[PDB]
Design an enzyme around this catalytic site. Structure first.
Site, PDB file in Angstrom:
ATOM      1  N   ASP A  83      -1.213  -7.392   0.954  1.00 16.69           N
ATOM      2  CA  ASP A  83      -0.351  -6.220   1.096  1.00 16.69           C
ATOM      3  C   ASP A  83       1.105  -6.670   1.218  1.00 16.69           C
ATOM      4  O   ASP A  83       1.714  -6.660   2.288  1.00 16.69           O
ATOM      5  CB  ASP A  83      -0.790  -5.387   2.298  1.00 16.69           C
ATOM      6  CG  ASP A  83      -0.238  -3.972   2.266  1.00 16.69           C
ATOM      7  OD1 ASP A  83       0.889  -3.773   1.765  1.00 16.69           O
ATOM      8  OD2 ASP A  83      -0.935  -3.054   2.746  1.00 16.69           O
ATOM      9  N   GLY A 124       6.075  -2.036   7.061  1.00 17.85           N
ATOM     10  CA  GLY A 124       6.996  -3.120   6.789  1.00 17.85           C
ATOM     11  C   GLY A 124       7.737  -3.652   7.993  1.00 17.85           C
ATOM     12  O   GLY A 124       8.854  -4.158   7.836  1.00 17.85           O
ATOM     13  N   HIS A 175       0.818  -1.209   0.000  1.00 16.14           N
ATOM     14  CA  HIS A 175       0.000   0.000   0.000  1.00 16.14           C
ATOM     15  C   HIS A 175       0.854   1.261   0.000  1.00 16.14           C
ATOM     16  O   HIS A 175       0.422   2.300  -0.514  1.00 16.14           O
ATOM     17  CB  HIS A 175      -0.945  -0.003   1.201  1.00 16.14           C
ATOM     18  CG  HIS A 175      -0.249   0.123   2.521  1.00 16.14           C
ATOM     19  ND1 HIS A 175       0.353  -0.945   3.150  1.00 16.14           N
ATOM     20  CD2 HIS A 175      -0.064   1.191   3.332  1.00 16.14           C
ATOM     21  CE1 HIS A 175       0.882  -0.540   4.291  1.00 16.14           C
ATOM     22  NE2 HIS A 175       0.643   0.752   4.425  1.00 16.14           N
TER      23      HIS A 175
END
Ligand SMILES: *[C@@H]1O[C@H](CO)[C@@H](O[C@@H]2O[C@H](CO)[C@@H](O)[C@H](O)[C@H]2NC(C)=O)[C@H](O)[C@H]1NC(C)=O
Ligand SMILES: *[C@@H]1O[C@H](CO)[C@@H](O)[C@H](O)[C@H]1NC(C)=O
Lengths: 97, 236, 292
Positions: free
Chosen positions: B90, B187, B41
């Site tokens: 994602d 992340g 994203h």
């Protein structure tokens, strides 16, 4: 001391105890409410306190005896606060000889 | 990361920082010197460009961040089954020109093999550059903490996440709160200790609040997409 | 005490921190008697020291003083149980009688204590702006604290409102975020109150024209059980003393009974503190008064 009937402005309060303390002797006695006088005898001997009472003009009768072991020293009569004993409305008087 | 202790140097040698416009914005995880795992994203348009990115590895603090970093940033690979309105799939892959040289405090994490018999309430670690205040301002050092894996059938309760969890979505953190991720942890590597081997099973996707009650963490299930990762190995 | 154990059918009698034999021939200044029925399922929880529901939510027996326990029975033919909730805030918001069945006793399973500001009501204006999972809201009397509900933003939902004490106070995920806290009763007082489900209290869309009334199912933390065994009910009692070898109340068993008189026989008498010897003969007298 206040009167039950025709109560006064204040309230009867002579002891402050949340719980009932240790008592030695507790009883209830009856008498004729139509009499006009009452006689009492109180005394002590050898540390033993005796009581006598009578309604009419007669020698008093036995009430009780109590062992205390100590010699008492003072007695008192609590005044009566009432809205009827005053002579303005009832013309009555208290007598305690 | 709220309520976490400072990470000593040489403890989590897989923190890769992705900096755009001369400032760190997102993190990443290194599995092979030719591929980096990050969030999909955050790599959307108009940021979906091979240039205008920088990769930093081995930086134990933000003070050392300056001119000079790893190899050039190649094109990004995103999962075609991803969506914007609904959070699903994602996962993003970043490629580098030169291979990442394994330094002293450099060790890539191993991909989870299909089939592990993971513990339902298993302790895991989350490390990254997060915040400890209201949305935070920045992060100068590595911050790491420990969390637990909430069950899928329990995290989607009618009072927290009613009909808001996909089969490729897991919850990490505490139900009572006070320990969770915050804004800027895009992340964040989710590693766990299994047979003295660290495995990457989660990836930060989104969240609600920071270290608050009734709002656990949200992470992606990499084990479902691992094969797709191998697909990239068949591509390049 | 012997006459008490003889007249009332005593099933078990023990004493902690004191000897039963020492009771015979002693004087206690005061005695406190705490009695209540015995549940059949949780009878073993009446042991001296246990983490049971009865001792933790209904009545706990202090072991730092000398006391006695007595388990007895009573014919269940004329036994009636009067149930009541000794909770102020629970009765304030609309609690009523149980009315479950006869010959059944109710024991509390969980106890919760609150301060003088709790209200099973949400804010009307706050609950109105909640398009997803709108909590019920209504008005509270003058002086309280409404339910803490906050609207948090989500990915696409912008009216997702959360509240406190979820899902239930018995199995709340975050006990520190709920107003009512679980408390353990000590010695002398009663249970603070039952659990309150805030999700079942009040009405939806109330314009400050209705009080906070919870349904009968909104109260949790209690269980009813029968107390009939062999056509009888078991009742426990606890005697707490206040002093040893000091007090007017003594034991009458360690005294001299009133024997029967004997006529035409030389007998030794101890009449009214006056001792002697002699013979007794019945006669009719009228000169005896009440005190003589
Ligand atoms: C003696 O008589 C008085 C008056 O009847 C008793 O006093 C009452 O006691 C009862 C029970 O404790 C109370 O509910 C009443 O309010 C009391 N009335 C008054 C005017 O005090 C007293 O208890 C009796 N004493 C004994 C030993 O029986
Ligand atoms: C004397 O003996 C007779 C006959 O046995 C008996 O009736 C009477 O009571 C006795 N008297 C005494 C004082 O023992």
């Amino acid at each position: 001391t206040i009167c039950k009937s025709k109560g006064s402005s204040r309230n009867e309060s002579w002891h402050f105890d949340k719980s009932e303390p240790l008592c030695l002797f507790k009883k209830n006695f009856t008498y004729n409410v139509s009499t006009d006088w009452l006689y009492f005898h109180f005394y002590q001997e050898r540390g033993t306190f005796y009581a006598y009472y009578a309604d009419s003009g007669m020698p008093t009768t036995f009430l009780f005896s109590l062992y205390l072991g100590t010699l008492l020293s003072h007695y008192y009569v609590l005044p009566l606060t009432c809205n009827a004993i005053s002579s303005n409305t009832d013309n009555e008087t208290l007598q305690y000889w | 990361i709220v309520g976490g202790e400072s990470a000593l140097p040489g403890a989590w040698p897989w923190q890769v920082s992705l900096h755009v416009q001369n400032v760190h914005v997102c993190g990443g995880s290194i599995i092979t010197p030719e591929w980096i795992v990050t969030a999909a994203h955050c790599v959307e348009k108009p940021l979906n460009n091979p240039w205008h990115w920088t990769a930093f590895a081995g930086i134990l603090r933000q003070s050392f961040m300056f001119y000079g970093a790893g190899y050039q940033v190649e094109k990004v690979i995103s999962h075609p089954n991803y969506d914007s309105k609904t959070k699903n799939n994602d996962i993003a892959l970043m490629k580098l020109q030169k291979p990442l040289t394994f330094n002293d405090l450099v060790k890539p994490v191993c991909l989870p093999n299909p089939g592990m018999m993971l513990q339902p309430e298993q302790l895991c670690w989350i490390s990254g550059w997060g915040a400890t205040e209201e949305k935070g301002k920045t992060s100068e050092v590595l911050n790491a903490a420990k969390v637990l894996l909430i069950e899928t059938q329990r995290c989607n309760s009618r009072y927290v996440y009613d009909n808001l969890i996909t089969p490729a979505m897991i919850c990490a953190g505490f139900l009572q709160g006070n320990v969770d991720s915050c804004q800027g942890d895009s992340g964040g590597p989710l590693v766990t200790s299994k047979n003295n081997i660290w495995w990457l099973i989660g990836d930060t996707s989104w969240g609600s609040g920071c270290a608050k009650a009734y709002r656990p963490g949200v992470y992606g299930n990499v084990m479902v997409f691992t094969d797709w990762i191998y697909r990239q190995m068949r591509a390049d | 005490l012997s006459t008490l154990l003889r007249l009332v059918h005593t099933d078990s009698f023990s004493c902690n921190n004191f000897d039963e034999s020492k009771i015979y021939g002693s004087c206690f200044k005061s005695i406190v008697l705490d009695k209540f029925a015995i549940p059949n399922s949780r009878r073993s929880d009446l042991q001296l020291g246990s983490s049971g529901f009865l001792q933790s939510s209904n009545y706990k027996i202090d072991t730092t003083s000398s006391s006695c326990q007595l388990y007895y029975s009573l014919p269940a033919i004329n036994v009636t149980i009067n149930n009541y909730n000794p909770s102020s805030w629970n009765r304030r918001y609309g609690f009523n009688n149980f009315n479950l069945s006869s010959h059944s006793v109710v024991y509390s399973r969980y106890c919760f204590s609150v301060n003088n500001t709790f209200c099973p009501c949400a804010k009307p204006s706050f609950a109105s702006s909640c398009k997803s999972h709108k909590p019920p809201s209504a008005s509270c009397p003058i002086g309280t604290n409404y339910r803490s509900c906050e609207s948090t933003t989500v990915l696409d939902h912008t009216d997702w409102c959360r509240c406190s004490c979820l899902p239930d106070p018995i199995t709340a995920y975050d006990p520190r975020s709920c107003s009512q806290k679980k408390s353990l009763v000590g010695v002398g007082e009663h249970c603070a109150g039952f659990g309150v489900d805030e999700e079942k209290c009040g009405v939806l869309d109330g314009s400050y024209n209705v009080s906070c009334l919870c349904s009968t199912d909104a109260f949790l933390g209690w269980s009813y059980d029968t107390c009939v065994s062999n056509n009888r009910c078991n009742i426990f009692s606890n005697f707490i003393l206040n002093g040893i070898n000091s007090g007017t109340t003594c034991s009458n068993d360690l005294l001299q009974p009133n024997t029967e008189v004997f006529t035409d026989v030389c007998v030794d008498y101890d009449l009214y503190g006056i001792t002697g010897q002699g013979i007794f003969k019945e006669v009719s007298a009228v000169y005896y008064n009440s005190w003589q």
